[PDB]
């Protein structure tokens, strides 16, 4: 879908009507786009936090893994995710019995499949932001992404 | 109506989807029931 | 080419020709003390002006059928045929509904239409359908 | 035959207990269509022995 | 698109999509991929 | 109906208030129900701005763009809402409100003019000199000249083509709470007035064996109106936190004031009187009919709790009961809804420190009669 949108955006003048219409479409589907962007950047931050060393501090089991409670408080101490996103990450975790979460595989589950769509979303937002600038609506999406 | 009964009912059981579409279509065409069970007719099953 | 949208004020009218007179009526109901709805004529406004304070209705949701079933089991969109809608009264703030009472003597299957205090039931949803094949 | 068809289109007992919305509404439509007093009257007229 | 939305609403309450639901989403999404590719090919060359 | 949706601009189908020029005065109606027969329109300035008397709905007479933006100089109908009477041009006076039966485009059509000289509209800085449409007559104050005339201006409006100094007006919308309450006042007053007329139609005329003296009377409609009015004036729930319950007390208090200031209190007092004059359900069956007597007990009971709901928590409405203090105590010994009258009395005495000032020995004997 994003590739088709880019093809519509081919050969676009600055403040072209197609670019303005695509911005209007995005801001009419604001909530859905916000959910998509949050989904991508939440797992990007998750990979960054797993790579961070404070998370390694909270990890204590010798065989890897981490208790669900330890995950909750560690990812709360990083102070980058709210409560709902914290619970959503807990839900998306494997949650192996005894509340053991293999954080390495958890972080790498959504890294490769979501890369191709994530890049094209970045290209779409960059193309829009540079072909219809001074747009009050689009800066919100830029900041969210 | 005999054909419709054979379609809807089977093995002492009522097929839910067939029953649903059958009642929806029958109720969609109010003239199917006859002079009784219609407000224009003004008569019921007893009068029938 | 304007389309009706969610969360706007709108009136429901019907044109019927009786005694070679093409009356145009609009549905209304006071709600409080009389839940039942009746239609007052909007035609002949010059002689008998109509009543507009209780005949106006606000759209609340224009949800699809499957999403309706899911919401039952648990903006500013645009309306499309096949969608079921929720209507709220203007003065009454009560959602229009189909009641189980049958004071309409003419037809046994004919049910009364009246306002409802809440909207948790499925009685306040109306699936619109196309008029013509066009 | 019409009444027998409606009875064979009546929803199941376990469905109506579980509370299927469509089953409840179909039974409601049948209830509105066929009034009970008509049934007991039609049973009350006897045969010709 | 409307049919896929209706299918998603059908599974909206369910916790886990079963095997038949996964297969049917695969069919619909593959067909949507082909439709999207053809729509893209109608405009990839800059045909105003 | 909302063809154009602009914030801060006047739109059709929007009830509002017309403060002529200064904020102090506004377009009003006759004070009581019979002082001017609810026909003479005035320019009274004061506490009436809060009341339902100061309220007018501009319905666009033009069926096209009904409820849409009000364009400059467009025909339209002013409605009182509270009485359901369209303001219109009259021949015996300048202009008065008329019934919808008497409402026609030749009389009810007005329009908003930018300038008083011959040759869009915003809620703020309106300053529009309104003018009749079918005629060139111009709405101007009478300015009557305290003993000679009351302190409020009460400048009755006259339709006369003279251009006075100030014909500008300010359109300020009222709250949805105010509009809803006023519409309840109109519908409920109409229902109970017709109910009173039925009471008078079979007043003292024995039914005998046929139909009652008058036509059928709405019993179930009055029952539903009684119930949802009681629920409307239900007190705020105690378990709410301070801010909720205080705000709800404030809203309930002003709603009680609005309903009391429009004669609804006296209306229900009249209803309960003419239901008292039939002492028993047997009496109600004898005159008004057995079918109407079936619900007499319920109607009387819910009337008493309606009265209690209206007066409870408001000092002013219950202080008005000083003149009718004996009125409550007289019906106290009645067998039907005795707890109803007694609760009404209790609210009166607790919330008014003056009924108890004028309490007399015979009244105390009546209370001891209740105990005995």
Short mmCIF file of C-alpha atoms in Angstrom, two decimals, chain F residues 3-350:
data_model
loop_
_atom_site.label_atom_id
_atom_site.label_comp_id
_atom_site.label_asym_id
_atom_site.label_seq_id
_atom_site.Cartn_x
_atom_site.Cartn_y
_atom_site.Cartn_z
CA UNK F 3 -26.04 23.71 6.48
CA UNK F 4 -23.34 26.02 7.88
CA UNK F 5 -21.60 25.33 11.21
CA UNK F 6 -19.89 28.49 12.49
CA UNK F 7 -18.92 28.92 16.13
CA UNK F 8 -19.98 32.18 17.75
CA UNK F 9 -22.53 33.03 15.06
CA UNK F 10 -26.32 32.98 15.31
CA UNK F 11 -27.94 30.06 13.51
CA UNK F 12 -31.50 28.99 12.83
CA UNK F 13 -33.32 26.79 15.29
CA UNK F 14 -31.21 28.22 18.12
CA UNK F 15 -33.00 29.39 21.24
CA UNK F 16 -31.37 32.46 22.76
CA UNK F 17 -31.99 35.72 24.61
CA UNK F 18 -32.34 39.22 23.16
CA UNK F 19 -30.83 41.87 25.43
CA UNK F 20 -31.85 45.19 23.88
CA UNK F 21 -28.73 47.35 23.82
CA UNK F 22 -27.37 47.28 27.35
CA UNK F 23 -27.01 43.98 29.19
CA UNK F 24 -29.52 45.05 31.84
CA UNK F 25 -32.75 44.69 29.85
CA UNK F 26 -34.05 42.05 27.46
CA UNK F 27 -37.15 40.93 25.57
CA UNK F 28 -39.59 39.52 28.13
CA UNK F 29 -43.21 38.35 28.39
CA UNK F 30 -46.09 39.03 30.80
CA UNK F 31 -45.06 38.31 34.39
CA UNK F 32 -47.71 35.80 35.49
CA UNK F 33 -50.05 33.63 33.44
CA UNK F 34 -52.97 36.06 33.75
CA UNK F 35 -51.42 39.51 34.30
CA UNK F 36 -51.54 40.21 30.55
CA UNK F 37 -53.06 36.85 29.48
CA UNK F 38 -49.52 35.88 28.31
CA UNK F 39 -49.93 38.14 25.28
CA UNK F 40 -48.32 41.52 26.01
CA UNK F 41 -44.58 41.62 25.33
CA UNK F 42 -42.31 43.98 27.27
CA UNK F 43 -38.71 45.20 27.67
CA UNK F 44 -38.25 44.41 31.36
CA UNK F 45 -34.75 44.62 32.79
CA UNK F 46 -33.53 42.81 35.88
CA UNK F 47 -33.52 39.29 37.31
CA UNK F 48 -35.85 38.16 34.50
CA UNK F 49 -32.82 37.46 32.27
CA UNK F 50 -32.18 34.25 34.20
CA UNK F 51 -35.85 33.22 34.11
CA UNK F 52 -37.52 31.28 31.32
CA UNK F 53 -39.59 34.38 30.52
CA UNK F 54 -36.54 35.88 28.78
CA UNK F 55 -36.17 33.29 26.02
CA UNK F 56 -36.89 33.31 22.29
CA UNK F 57 -36.25 30.74 19.56
CA UNK F 58 -35.62 32.10 16.07
CA UNK F 59 -37.08 29.54 13.69
CA UNK F 60 -36.36 30.38 10.03
CA UNK F 61 -39.77 30.60 8.38
CA UNK F 62 -38.00 29.91 5.08
CA UNK F 63 -38.27 26.12 4.82
CA UNK F 64 -35.22 26.20 2.57
CA UNK F 65 -32.10 26.56 4.73
CA UNK F 66 -34.20 25.71 7.79
CA UNK F 67 -31.90 25.95 10.79
CA UNK F 68 -29.03 27.15 8.58
CA UNK F 69 -27.12 30.42 9.06
CA UNK F 70 -29.36 33.45 9.54
CA UNK F 71 -28.69 35.78 6.63
CA UNK F 72 -29.16 39.53 7.02
CA UNK F 73 -32.75 40.59 6.47
CA UNK F 74 -34.32 37.18 6.30
CA UNK F 75 -37.92 36.26 7.13
CA UNK F 76 -38.18 34.17 10.29
CA UNK F 77 -40.40 33.60 13.32
CA UNK F 78 -39.67 34.47 16.95
CA UNK F 79 -41.14 31.94 19.39
CA UNK F 80 -41.48 32.30 23.15
CA UNK F 81 -40.80 28.54 23.62
CA UNK F 82 -42.03 28.73 27.23
CA UNK F 83 -45.60 29.36 26.09
CA UNK F 84 -45.24 28.18 22.49
CA UNK F 85 -46.43 31.50 21.06
CA UNK F 86 -44.97 33.14 17.95
CA UNK F 87 -44.25 36.84 18.41
CA UNK F 88 -46.03 38.70 15.63
CA UNK F 89 -47.45 41.99 14.41
CA UNK F 90 -50.90 42.79 15.78
CA UNK F 91 -53.51 45.38 14.82
CA UNK F 92 -54.93 46.38 18.21
CA UNK F 93 -51.42 47.13 19.55
CA UNK F 94 -47.86 47.33 18.26
CA UNK F 95 -46.92 43.66 18.33
CA UNK F 96 -47.89 40.74 20.57
CA UNK F 97 -47.32 37.01 20.78
CA UNK F 98 -49.95 34.84 19.08
CA UNK F 99 -50.82 31.17 19.03
CA UNK F 100 -49.46 29.01 16.21
CA UNK F 101 -53.02 28.96 14.87
CA UNK F 102 -52.87 32.77 14.61
CA UNK F 103 -49.27 32.64 13.36
CA UNK F 104 -48.97 33.46 9.65
CA UNK F 105 -46.20 34.89 7.49
CA UNK F 106 -48.01 38.23 7.25
CA UNK F 107 -47.61 38.70 11.01
CA UNK F 108 -44.76 36.53 12.34
CA UNK F 109 -42.14 37.48 9.73
CA UNK F 110 -39.28 39.59 11.07
CA UNK F 111 -35.74 40.22 9.85
CA UNK F 112 -32.48 41.62 11.18
CA UNK F 113 -31.34 44.93 9.68
CA UNK F 114 -27.76 46.20 9.66
CA UNK F 115 -28.64 49.91 9.71
CA UNK F 116 -31.82 51.75 10.61
CA UNK F 117 -31.54 53.75 7.40
CA UNK F 118 -32.63 51.80 4.33
CA UNK F 119 -29.38 50.49 2.80
CA UNK F 120 -22.94 37.10 8.67
CA UNK F 121 -24.73 38.02 11.89
CA UNK F 122 -22.54 37.24 14.90
CA UNK F 123 -23.54 36.47 18.48
CA UNK F 124 -20.98 39.01 19.69
CA UNK F 125 -21.42 42.68 18.76
CA UNK F 126 -24.76 42.00 17.07
CA UNK F 127 -26.25 45.52 17.35
CA UNK F 128 -28.96 44.64 14.83
CA UNK F 129 -32.12 46.73 14.56
CA UNK F 130 -34.76 44.08 13.94
CA UNK F 131 -37.70 45.00 11.70
CA UNK F 132 -40.96 43.44 10.58
CA UNK F 133 -41.03 42.01 7.06
CA UNK F 134 -44.60 42.27 5.74
CA UNK F 135 -44.87 45.88 6.97
CA UNK F 136 -42.43 48.74 7.45
CA UNK F 137 -43.36 49.10 11.13
CA UNK F 138 -40.38 49.20 13.48
CA UNK F 139 -40.11 47.60 16.92
CA UNK F 140 -39.56 50.43 19.41
CA UNK F 141 -39.95 50.75 23.16
CA UNK F 142 -42.87 52.67 24.64
CA UNK F 143 -40.67 54.20 27.40
CA UNK F 144 -43.40 54.74 30.03
CA UNK F 145 -42.81 57.33 32.74
CA UNK F 146 -41.58 54.34 41.17
CA UNK F 147 -45.27 54.89 41.91
CA UNK F 148 -46.23 55.97 38.38
CA UNK F 149 -44.56 52.95 36.78
CA UNK F 150 -42.58 50.07 38.27
CA UNK F 151 -38.82 50.31 38.74
CA UNK F 152 -38.26 47.84 35.93
CA UNK F 153 -38.56 49.60 32.59
CA UNK F 154 -41.44 47.45 31.26
CA UNK F 155 -41.23 49.40 27.99
CA UNK F 156 -43.84 47.54 25.94
CA UNK F 157 -42.77 47.04 22.34
CA UNK F 158 -44.74 48.74 19.57
CA UNK F 159 -44.48 48.18 15.83
CA UNK F 160 -44.33 51.71 14.44
CA UNK F 161 -42.22 52.92 11.53
CA UNK F 162 -40.58 55.67 13.61
CA UNK F 163 -36.87 55.15 14.17
CA UNK F 164 -36.10 55.47 17.87
CA UNK F 165 -32.66 56.09 19.37
CA UNK F 166 -31.84 52.45 20.23
CA UNK F 167 -33.39 49.62 18.22
CA UNK F 168 -30.25 47.48 18.39
CA UNK F 169 -30.32 44.14 20.18
CA UNK F 170 -27.79 41.61 21.45
CA UNK F 171 -28.27 37.91 20.73
CA UNK F 172 -26.81 35.77 23.53
CA UNK F 173 -27.45 32.04 23.48
CA UNK F 174 -28.64 30.30 26.63
CA UNK F 175 -27.44 26.98 27.98
CA UNK F 176 -28.78 23.65 26.79
CA UNK F 177 -29.88 23.12 30.39
CA UNK F 178 -31.98 26.29 30.21
CA UNK F 179 -33.45 25.37 26.83
CA UNK F 180 -34.31 21.85 27.95
CA UNK F 181 -35.88 23.06 31.20
CA UNK F 182 -37.95 25.71 29.40
CA UNK F 183 -39.23 23.18 26.88
CA UNK F 184 -40.24 20.90 29.77
CA UNK F 185 -42.04 23.87 31.31
CA UNK F 186 -43.99 24.46 28.11
CA UNK F 187 -44.99 20.84 27.48
CA UNK F 188 -45.77 20.09 31.13
CA UNK F 189 -47.81 23.26 31.62
CA UNK F 190 -49.81 22.48 28.49
CA UNK F 191 -50.48 18.93 29.65
CA UNK F 192 -51.61 19.95 33.12
CA UNK F 193 -53.67 22.88 31.85
CA UNK F 194 -55.60 20.48 29.62
CA UNK F 195 -55.88 18.12 32.60
CA UNK F 196 -57.35 20.97 34.66
CA UNK F 197 -59.82 21.68 31.84
CA UNK F 198 -60.90 18.04 31.97
CA UNK F 199 -61.32 18.33 35.73
CA UNK F 200 -63.60 21.31 35.13
CA UNK F 201 -65.47 19.50 32.35
CA UNK F 202 -66.58 16.75 34.73
CA UNK F 203 -66.54 19.08 37.76
CA UNK F 204 -69.52 18.06 39.88
CA UNK F 205 -71.44 16.42 37.04
CA UNK F 206 -72.48 12.85 37.95
CA UNK F 207 -71.70 10.25 35.30
CA UNK F 208 -74.66 8.02 36.12
CA UNK F 209 -74.34 4.97 33.88
CA UNK F 210 -72.93 6.27 30.58
CA UNK F 211 -69.63 7.91 29.67
CA UNK F 212 -68.19 10.63 31.94
CA UNK F 213 -69.33 14.23 31.66
CA UNK F 214 -66.42 15.39 29.52
CA UNK F 215 -64.16 13.63 27.02
CA UNK F 216 -61.30 11.27 27.86
CA UNK F 217 -58.54 12.63 30.07
CA UNK F 218 -54.82 11.77 29.87
CA UNK F 219 -54.00 9.70 32.95
CA UNK F 220 -51.00 7.71 31.73
CA UNK F 221 -49.44 10.76 30.05
CA UNK F 222 -49.67 12.66 33.33
CA UNK F 223 -48.26 9.60 35.11
CA UNK F 224 -45.16 9.53 32.91
CA UNK F 225 -44.75 13.30 33.13
CA UNK F 226 -45.01 13.11 36.92
CA UNK F 227 -42.44 10.32 37.14
CA UNK F 228 -39.78 11.85 34.92
CA UNK F 229 -40.23 15.28 36.51
CA UNK F 230 -39.66 13.69 39.93
CA UNK F 231 -36.58 11.93 38.59
CA UNK F 232 -35.45 15.20 37.03
CA UNK F 233 -35.62 16.94 40.41
CA UNK F 234 -34.12 14.01 42.32
CA UNK F 235 -31.54 15.34 44.81
CA UNK F 236 -27.82 14.81 44.17
CA UNK F 237 -26.52 11.48 45.42
CA UNK F 238 -24.67 11.71 48.73
CA UNK F 239 -21.74 9.40 47.91
CA UNK F 240 -20.46 11.84 45.28
CA UNK F 241 -17.41 13.89 46.13
CA UNK F 242 -17.79 17.48 47.29
CA UNK F 243 -17.30 19.19 43.93
CA UNK F 244 -19.77 16.98 42.04
CA UNK F 245 -22.52 17.20 44.61
CA UNK F 246 -22.13 20.94 45.17
CA UNK F 247 -22.26 21.63 41.43
CA UNK F 248 -25.30 19.37 41.09
CA UNK F 249 -26.93 21.16 44.03
CA UNK F 250 -26.35 24.46 42.25
CA UNK F 251 -27.84 23.15 39.00
CA UNK F 252 -30.80 21.61 40.83
CA UNK F 253 -31.38 24.83 42.76
CA UNK F 254 -31.52 27.03 39.68
CA UNK F 255 -33.67 24.48 37.83
CA UNK F 256 -36.11 24.53 40.75
CA UNK F 257 -36.08 28.32 40.57
CA UNK F 258 -36.82 28.24 36.83
CA UNK F 259 -39.74 25.84 37.24
CA UNK F 260 -41.14 27.75 40.22
CA UNK F 261 -40.95 31.18 38.59
CA UNK F 262 -43.21 30.09 35.71
CA UNK F 263 -46.25 29.28 37.83
CA UNK F 264 -45.70 25.53 37.69
CA UNK F 265 -45.82 25.37 41.49
CA UNK F 266 -49.25 27.01 41.59
CA UNK F 267 -50.29 24.79 38.68
CA UNK F 268 -49.61 21.56 40.58
CA UNK F 269 -51.24 23.08 43.67
CA UNK F 270 -54.37 23.63 41.59
CA UNK F 271 -54.17 20.03 40.33
CA UNK F 272 -53.92 18.63 43.84
CA UNK F 273 -56.85 20.81 44.99
CA UNK F 274 -59.24 19.67 42.27
CA UNK F 275 -58.18 16.09 42.90
CA UNK F 276 -58.89 16.58 46.61
CA UNK F 277 -62.46 17.73 45.94
CA UNK F 278 -63.15 14.11 44.91
CA UNK F 279 -62.70 12.68 48.39
CA UNK F 280 -62.46 9.01 47.41
CA UNK F 281 -61.82 6.82 44.38
CA UNK F 282 -65.53 5.98 44.62
CA UNK F 283 -66.30 9.68 44.18
CA UNK F 284 -63.89 9.82 41.24
CA UNK F 285 -65.73 6.87 39.69
CA UNK F 286 -69.10 8.55 40.27
CA UNK F 287 -68.21 11.82 38.54
CA UNK F 288 -65.17 11.33 36.30
CA UNK F 289 -65.60 7.63 35.62
CA UNK F 290 -64.28 4.35 36.98
CA UNK F 291 -61.48 4.10 34.40
CA UNK F 292 -60.11 7.49 35.46
CA UNK F 293 -60.66 6.60 39.13
CA UNK F 294 -58.39 3.57 38.65
CA UNK F 295 -55.27 5.76 38.85
CA UNK F 296 -56.46 8.58 41.14
CA UNK F 297 -54.47 7.34 44.15
CA UNK F 298 -51.22 7.15 42.19
CA UNK F 299 -51.73 10.53 40.52
CA UNK F 300 -52.39 12.29 43.84
CA UNK F 301 -49.44 10.58 45.54
CA UNK F 302 -46.93 11.45 42.81
CA UNK F 303 -48.27 15.01 42.82
CA UNK F 304 -47.29 15.31 46.47
CA UNK F 305 -43.78 13.99 45.88
CA UNK F 306 -43.48 16.30 42.87
CA UNK F 307 -44.32 19.24 45.14
CA UNK F 308 -41.80 18.02 47.71
CA UNK F 309 -39.11 17.66 45.04
CA UNK F 310 -39.73 21.17 43.72
CA UNK F 311 -39.52 22.84 47.13
CA UNK F 312 -36.87 20.69 48.84
CA UNK F 313 -33.46 22.32 49.05
CA UNK F 314 -34.68 25.75 47.93
CA UNK F 315 -35.44 28.35 50.57
CA UNK F 316 -37.34 30.74 48.29
CA UNK F 317 -39.84 28.25 46.85
CA UNK F 318 -40.67 26.94 50.32
CA UNK F 319 -40.78 30.45 51.79
CA UNK F 320 -43.52 31.17 49.27
CA UNK F 321 -45.52 28.56 51.21
CA UNK F 322 -46.05 31.00 54.11
CA UNK F 323 -49.40 32.08 52.67
CA UNK F 324 -50.39 28.46 51.94
CA UNK F 325 -49.21 27.16 55.33
CA UNK F 326 -52.79 26.36 56.35
CA UNK F 327 -53.30 24.82 52.91
CA UNK F 328 -50.80 22.05 53.67
CA UNK F 329 -52.04 21.41 57.20
CA UNK F 330 -55.69 21.19 56.12
CA UNK F 331 -55.08 18.13 53.93
CA UNK F 332 -52.76 16.54 56.49
CA UNK F 333 -55.36 14.20 58.01
CA UNK F 334 -56.33 12.79 54.60
CA UNK F 335 -56.03 9.02 54.34
CA UNK F 336 -54.36 8.90 50.91
CA UNK F 337 -50.61 9.61 50.64
CA UNK F 338 -50.53 10.94 54.20
CA UNK F 339 -46.76 10.47 54.23
CA UNK F 340 -46.78 12.56 51.06
CA UNK F 341 -48.39 15.59 52.68
CA UNK F 342 -46.32 15.06 55.81
CA UNK F 343 -43.03 15.02 53.89
CA UNK F 344 -44.11 18.15 52.01
CA UNK F 345 -44.78 19.80 55.37
CA UNK F 346 -41.43 18.65 56.73
CA UNK F 347 -39.54 20.23 53.85
CA UNK F 348 -41.54 23.45 54.30
CA UNK F 349 -40.70 23.79 57.98
CA UNK F 350 -37.03 22.80 57.76
#
